């Protein structure tokens, strides 16, 4: 009875533009999904889908290859659903996350640049030898339940 644990980092960067765009976009931002500490999650990740707000053209943004990121400009923050799909025949084939993109914070001295990061731990129960190999090539660690 083997249990495999893998870690993913979800984060974002946002910066006030020197000059707003013609449509009034005030900020440049990036949202990303990556492995911690030089672990390559491409061994076990097939693709990552970033679901942007309806206001953006073609909101369903797909990264099938690293880097897994979206870089955009805008005027407001929003909740971004994010789907990480696995290189697995069996279930689970995907995991769903939600990421809160925030562009600003209220502060005595204004800050032009912002960055945030979260650590998400994923647990797979009795994977196949092929998928286990994939998770462990990406820095996964196995415990016994």
């Amino acid at each position: 009875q083997c249990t495999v644990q893998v870690r993913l980092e979800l984060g974002h960067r946002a910066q006030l533009r020197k000059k707003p765009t013609t449509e009034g976009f005030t900020h440049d931002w990036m949202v990303f999904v990556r492995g911690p500490e030089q672990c390559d999650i491409q061994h076990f990740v097939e693709k990552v889908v970033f679901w942007l707000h309806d206001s953006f053209p073609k909101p369903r943004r797909v990264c099938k290859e690293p880097p897994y990121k979206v870089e955009e400009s805008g005027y407001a923050g929003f909740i971004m659903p994010i789907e990480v799909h696995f290189k697995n025949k069996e279930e689970p084939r995907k995991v769903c996350f939600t990421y809160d993109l925030f562009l600003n914070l209220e502060g005595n001295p204004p800050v032009n640049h912002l960055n945030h990061l979260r650590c998400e731990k994923l647990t797979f129960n009795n994977p196949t030898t092929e998928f286990r190999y994939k998770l462990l090539r990406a820095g996964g660690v196995m415990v016994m339940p």
Binding site: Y75, G77, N104
Partner: peptide, 4 residues
């Protein structure tokens, strides 16, 4: 502030 600005949210959507």
């Amino acid at each position: 502030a600005a949210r959507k």
